Design a protein around this ligand. Sequence first.
Ligand SMILES: *[C@H]1O[C@H](CO)[C@@H](O)[C@H](O)[C@@H]1F
Ligand SMILES: *[C@H]1O[C@H](CO)[C@@H](O)[C@H](O)[C@@H]1F
Ligand SMILES: *[C@H]1O[C@H](CO)[C@@H](O)[C@H](O)[C@@H]1F
Ligand SMILES: [Cl-]
Ligand SMILES: [Cl-]
Ligand SMILES: [Cl-]
Lengths: 648, 657, 649
Amino acid sequence: AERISKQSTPFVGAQIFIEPGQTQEQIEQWFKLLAESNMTTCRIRMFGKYMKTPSGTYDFTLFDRAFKLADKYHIKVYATLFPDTEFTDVGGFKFPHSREHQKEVEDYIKNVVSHFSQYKNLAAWVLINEPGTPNLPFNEPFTKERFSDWKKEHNFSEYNEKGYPVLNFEKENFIIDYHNWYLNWLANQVRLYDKQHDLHVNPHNVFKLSGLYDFPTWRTFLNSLGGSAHASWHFGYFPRKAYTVAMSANAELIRSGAGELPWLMTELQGGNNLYSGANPLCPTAEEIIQWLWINFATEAKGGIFWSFNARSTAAEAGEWAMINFKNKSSDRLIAAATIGKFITENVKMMSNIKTLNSGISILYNHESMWVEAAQTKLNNGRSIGAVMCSPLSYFEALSETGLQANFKEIKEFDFSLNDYTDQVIILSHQIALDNKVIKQLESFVEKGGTLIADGLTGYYDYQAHSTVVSGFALENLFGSYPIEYKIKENLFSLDFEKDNYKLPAHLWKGTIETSKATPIMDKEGECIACINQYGKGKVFWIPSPIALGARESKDFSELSKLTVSLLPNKILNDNPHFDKHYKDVMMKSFKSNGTMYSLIINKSASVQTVDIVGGKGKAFILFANKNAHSTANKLTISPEETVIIKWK
Amino acid sequence: EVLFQGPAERISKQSTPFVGAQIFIEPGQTQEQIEQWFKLLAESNMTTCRIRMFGKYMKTPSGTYDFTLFDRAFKLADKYHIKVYATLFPDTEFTDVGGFKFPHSREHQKEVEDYIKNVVSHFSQYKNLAAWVLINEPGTPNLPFNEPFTKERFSDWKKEHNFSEYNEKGYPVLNFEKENFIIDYHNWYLNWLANQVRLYDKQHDLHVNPHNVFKLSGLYDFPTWRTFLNSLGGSAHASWHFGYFPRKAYTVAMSANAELIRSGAGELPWLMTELQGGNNLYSGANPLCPTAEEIIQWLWINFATEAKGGIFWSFNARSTAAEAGEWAMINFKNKSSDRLIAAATIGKFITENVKMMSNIKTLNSGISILYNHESMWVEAAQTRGKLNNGRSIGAVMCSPLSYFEALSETGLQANFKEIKEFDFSLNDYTDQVIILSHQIALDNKVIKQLESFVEKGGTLIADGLTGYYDYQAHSTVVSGFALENLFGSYPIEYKIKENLFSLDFEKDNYKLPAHLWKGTIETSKATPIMDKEGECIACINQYGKGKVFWIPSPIALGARESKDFSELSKLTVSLLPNKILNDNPHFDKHYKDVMMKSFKSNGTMYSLIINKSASVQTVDIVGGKGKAFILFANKNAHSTANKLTISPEETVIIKWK
Amino acid sequence: ERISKQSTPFVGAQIFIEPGQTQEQIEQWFKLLAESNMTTCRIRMFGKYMKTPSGTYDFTLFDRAFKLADKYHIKVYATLFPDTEFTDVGGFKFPHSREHQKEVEDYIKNVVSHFSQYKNLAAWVLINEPGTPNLPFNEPFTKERFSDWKKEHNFSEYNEKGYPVLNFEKENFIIDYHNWYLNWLANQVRLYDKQHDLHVNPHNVFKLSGLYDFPTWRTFLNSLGGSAHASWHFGYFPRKAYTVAMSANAELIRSGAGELPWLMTELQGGNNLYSGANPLCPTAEEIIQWLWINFATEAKGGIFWSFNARSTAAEAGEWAMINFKNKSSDRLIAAATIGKFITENVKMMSNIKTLNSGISILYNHESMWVEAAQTRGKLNNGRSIGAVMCSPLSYFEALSETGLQANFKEIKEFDFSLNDYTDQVIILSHQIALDNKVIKQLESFVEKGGTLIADGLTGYYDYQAHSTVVSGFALENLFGSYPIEYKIKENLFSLDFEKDNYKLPAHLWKGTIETSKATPIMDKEGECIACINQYGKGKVFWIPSPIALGARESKDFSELSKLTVSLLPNKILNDNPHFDKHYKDVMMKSFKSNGTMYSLIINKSASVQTVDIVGGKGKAFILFANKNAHSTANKLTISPEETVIIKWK
Ligand SMILES: *[C@H]1O[C@H](CO)[C@@H](O)[C@H](O)[C@@H]1F
Ligand SMILES: *[C@H]1O[C@H](CO)[C@@H](O)[C@H](O)[C@@H]1F
Ligand SMILES: *[C@H]1O[C@H](CO)[C@@H](O)[C@H](O)[C@@H]1F
Ligand SMILES: [Cl-]
Ligand SMILES: [Cl-]
Ligand SMILES: [Cl-]
């Protein structure tokens, strides 16, 4: 069996939804049209409920029929392990209920994997669909016992080294280790019966659930990392006109989690919300093309849509499907097919995509989210999600300048190199940093790194103890000390001395006293920011939330201008970007075998002319779904259009 | 039925209608206050009261019953020739405003048995007793599945009912065990109360007042209730039950609430047991003090819809805690508010026109707006309990209510019926119309009935997600569309849009407001209708002698969300059989915030007209026969030919000569 | 020294002591506190930070703080605060169990025996922020105490006349349980220390006043405290009226205190980051406003929470008057100007007495209890919890914008036993519950010359939620009239009087009446909406529409001000300094010290205002002004956010 690699040819595919009641004729209609739509791959939920007989023995007939029809039309299968559960459980249970239930799951895996491993068209086991839940069942006897056990193996003091009170976040650290444990245990159960096939898993709702996910530990037992990125469930932090930015960030976040492993998007929205979804929609054809290009330009090795055909009963009946109710192509499948086709006509290019790293990394950490949950309310600086919305705003501001940026958990960043010249780290409202990471940040800047920090970055440590109160742990690196935070309106202006910038800011104004660092003053004569030279590199610190400020004002233009002014000149010379900020336009570049490309998407209401500067060579338009044209390096791109430029 | 009836009134479809009010009896009241109430009730041309027979105010420490407090009230009613609707109301907490809806326990069921034995044995002996109300406001949004009696009755119910997790074809299903149990449990307890009363009194009418009917209709099997009731009641409180409407459309609300009870009643007569008589202070969801104009509107709408009475809550007020000095028609000196003076003008009109008011029959246009329990049950499962709109609880009722409103503003009667209350057994349905507006659940059995109805000449109008699911929440739209035969077409996609969008038709530049979802179809036998974008959005199928119009976008919820039913009125009129518009009086065109409904009495035709607009309106009435003569008008309306000039808030009855 | 109504007032602040802090940091705090003209601190005596594994007490951490306070001549309010979870910010309000009650006995014995020995100890705070909306009826100690309470109290389900009743067992138990536990704490302290003042700080008083029997508390306290935090307690007001809020909060505690002196134990000293319901950072201008409003209302001190901040979790680096380098914020520099003014005017500031206009705005527990039962717990407005307090607070605001003092009292804190009430005024604004006993006291008050103003649903119910309006109006005698109807209307409507003199905003309900002895007042629509009754030497004005809630909802108190002034005895307007007319967002309140009269004026508007002060005697001289106010004759020109003290010569 073919193992996936960073050189595999990317695929477009879709969920094939198998339940009892379906006829051989309907199932074949689906696989035939899937193959005709230039799709290579399906995913199939291996429902234990539809394989278990009254007596307890397994009947594989319903799924044999589907696997055999996939094989006939040369379609390879991602098979999701999905034990018996309530019919009304849409997404599946995330952990065993009990020791008795764990044994039902052991028996389920033995039966399913032993049988279905024999099909030559099996491409992967999905160990579990959508691992992680906001609310873990601490009520249930299995989780209660595993948390009790976990606490006895971990010693915690109620005070720190200096004698101050601390929080230890026993619950949050247990939850990380419990996810690590059960996914590793599922991988091991599969490996008892099949060592030949790729192990995959699709983390979801990542801008809220990232605090459950230790992606570096997962790399030890996975072959590839998946994701669900549903416009209707996961992008609540954005308007629809910025789902481009949402999909870009979601992709960057999984890519970072994947590390040395290849990644793909296991779940994209293929169809209409009727009664389902939190932010319901029907993706436009234009949106299908945007989502596929953003994923592939971000190194994705596939895009699987949920779903090809629809469920028939209760939750989500006749929703999410790419085919209409006569089993023919919606404009969404016609659009997905144009991308399948582009791939088979440009195999060498699409098989070898590497993101063009600007060298900008936007870092988030679990501990900032844990501390925020303890200090806060659901809306905003004083609510759950500011610690993610803040980095997402820098991310958006850089997208509207046409620059790539990574989006990583801080443990996924490599702090071991000897040189970080022309590398940039943005810590936007990462309210919790400990001594160990401050040393890594000290090392990074010393060796040439640029560090940009805003909002309440470093206010607390990993124990929710504030060094701002006891003795500021970042005084050395920042070359300055915080004085006050004063709360203001939801939205206020930081007006810099000599009219250099008027910056939107959210909720709190910070004042500092500089020691080694160069002060920056506002028109009111207060010190609001500084630049510290620290070894070969530099630090820009502005302890007002200017990122949440741009988000709340719905204008990222001033955050874009400031951030560009702080970037090493090498980033702007070597990477294609926009001559200035463009509201609701995105660009992201990539390489394949030494050739550079640029993805451009216009999400504005009007035709835009973007001046692309930096990079090398003449823009040739390789892909454009609404007849964009270029004069020199000025691209004229229509609303909702996706453009790939090949630089010659 | 006549030896068993003896001297007691059997109410009938020929009974003389009454106006009446709740007389609120609690300890502390004096003989002088109680008499003041009954005296003024009689002087206000009211013939009837209702009295909550509080077990709490009759039970003694020892357990024996003391009837003194209620004897005093019944005797004073009899003195002023006032007949009593007596509500069975066992002992409960003082703070329990509406009363418990089911027994708590087997022990509690026996307290209720003993309560009924004592109260009915005693009070059946008064000659002025007109009716037993078996229970006040049967049904609750939230049933007590916690309590041991309900838990045991649901357990028992499930053991007597076998359900498969799959249908005939092999597909997964929901069975709605909870919802079907709740129907059968209401049927059971009301029937059991009726049987307890019948052990001791076979002479008097059994009555019950279902409430909040636009939300609670999925608890109510009215056809089964007919087996043990003599009349069907209702509560229709402007402050509790009309949340789906603004105040200026409480006319439409009261009209639909009346049509809904009338349909439930079938061969039984009905009356409105509970109307709002007075002011909300701290109580009510949408608080108000009814205007005099509103009291007259509500009474005429009910009588014109075959009601045999209107009982106001309340004549006098409660004195302590919940609703103290609220709801009363008398002021705090025990004299007439403008609300009682208004109610009295209607009592008087009745006693001066007895033959006419005793024989009212609604003039059926032949238009029937049908709802079903199962559409409400499936909606509750799909929306998972959101509360605002297509994607929330109540779209399945608001959609039919929009058609109903649009027909009211055209001056046409329409029935409002649960699908099981419609008669599908006739051989001819020429010039009959069925509207299925967003009835999202239809099974095979009912599709056959609809096929039969259209075949034999019926017109079927369907919009929104009608027929998307079956009674098991399985969607035939996905597996094989069960309505393909009747509609002569198949659905293609639903695409969600804004809260409010426009359906722009290919021809005549013509525009429908629509809510939430755009539906597209492929026609086989039916004639397609296309939009400007070249997609098929509606069709007309000729099926036997009758026709089907299908438009799977919600155009009814579309009119409701846009607060304009003018285009829904014009479209619906254009689909109607010509016979309906020739034989029934209606408006020459749509009139915003005006309502008309016609009725007959012994071969003479009448029309009720109410202006809820801000300005004097001149309505041209066409259809029917003869000269409009103004029989009733509370603000000096005049008519030149068939053009009525009617003032804001005015109620007019026209007699056709 | 024991506190008295002649004690010199102090400015002070919480000193927050927890493990981890160094001797050098603690000293920096006390040194700067002394340099900021502050004489006093409060210290939470955390049981958690004194208990050893073995169970014995180690006093080291607090010895260090007490000794450093003594070095800088700073006296200590010591809050009893037994062992509790680190995450419990405000502390438990009652013992969890009989076993827990014994841990608290042992805690008090150890802490009081030890710390009573320091010469700089000024007071024991028996418990921080007594009172909780929701009591732990779950927990075995409270369950047993409520069971016991019910067995000692017999209630009938009916009244004397035979009518059903509510008895409010829960609400009356809660009063008696607060009385009991605070008295029990006072007695435990007195086993070991009879030499030091006992203090307690009630909080969120506009919501929690129904938990507080202040007259009973006087029996065992030496002084009454209060928390009045802008970020937690002033939800019924916008920020531009926190002046009015602090004024009413002060009047409410002063009234509770009676013959006892009072002080504000907890004021907001600093910034909300993640904490607070209505978050802010007090301006320097706001610090000065709050201190002057409290002292002008007889406060003997203002203690800010906090001098220095907590370091971990809840409120870490929040609330502090010092910045993160341990130097003065503009808030501490402002507080210091007031400490300094005191030490330079000791005779004046030591003897402040409020100048009683004679206007008393009365609220009662029972109106709040009945409202909670009738609204069934809606939270927005006449049909929601808080109307019974918002209504009196609106009269209070309207009188503030006229420059008149008013008392704000629970009805049991008003003295009904005098023989003369000439030129005294009582306002009952939407006090929906009055019993026969209090109606007799009101009858007596008016007979003997009192003016009674009543609006909204005053007297609609009795203390058992029985409505005499329905059964036989208990206020017919005093009002000389009977209610006819209440009709619900819009949120906001206009009562337009027959005479073209008053158009009054009104909320929710229109009341109509029939007059017998009283003189009717008609509206343009011909309905009787109000009356004046002459009753003995005094008068009653009744208008049963809510005109106070009406002003609040319309954000205009100008018409309520003009009407109320027109009803006042001439003597109040001649003897008390007030404004020539209503001024939106300006407040004045006068006070005396040893026969000299003063006036506090605060401008909360966006612009310079010129207020004509009339009434009183003599020449306005500016004694205090933080933004160069001037007066020409009796016309004060006062800048936005400015606080002015006038000395009348
Ligand atoms: C991902 O999301 C889709 C859309 O709700 C689900 O149907 C699948 O179960 C999976 F959970
Ligand atoms: C109908 O509604 C009235 C008015 O609220 C209630 O008071 C009665 O109990 C009856 F339920
Ligand atoms: C008064 O207020 C402060 C601020 O929230 C609290 O920290 C203290 O515990 C006291 F409750
Ligand atoms: Cl799956
Ligand atoms: Cl009743
Ligand atoms: Cl304290």
